Design a protein around this ligand. Structure first.
Ligand SMILES: *[C@@H]1O[C@H](CO)[C@@H](O)[C@H](O)[C@H]1NC(C)=O
Lengths: 50, 50
């Protein structure tokens, strides 16, 4: 059971920046005071986000 | 059977023996499937819960 919606207003999606967002831990291992390189899926910096 | 080996804390173990904590002795051990030989002392670093 669902109710249809007919009051939606037409508006194209906007775009903003992603300066320093979209980073997480590549693995569950913990490292300290080191610089490590890991190849994994990530959000690129300075890109559109909807 | 699919094993998630050494990617997370492990709670599925078969054998176990009674042992007690010892300090300042470079002796062998097995921590969560990882083997080493070193002394056991304290430290001032802080550990995050995860
Ligand atoms: C986002 O896309 C628009 C075109 O769709 C473009 O003009 C704009 O430069 C893009 N912004 C970034 C940060 O890439």
């Amino acid at each position: 059971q669902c109710v249809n919606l007919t009051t939606r207003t037409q508006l194209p999606p906007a775009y903003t920046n992603s300066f320093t967002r979209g980073v997480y831990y590549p693995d569950k291992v913990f490292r300290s005071s080191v610089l490590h390189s890991t190849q994994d899926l990530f959000l690129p910096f300075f890109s559109n986000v909807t | 059977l699919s094993f998630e080996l050494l990617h997370a804390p492990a709670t599925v173990c078969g054998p176990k023996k009674s042992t007690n904590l010892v300090k300042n002795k470079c002796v062998n051990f097995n921590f969560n499937g990882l083997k080493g030989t070193g002394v056991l002392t304290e430290s001032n670093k802080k550990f995050l819960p995860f």
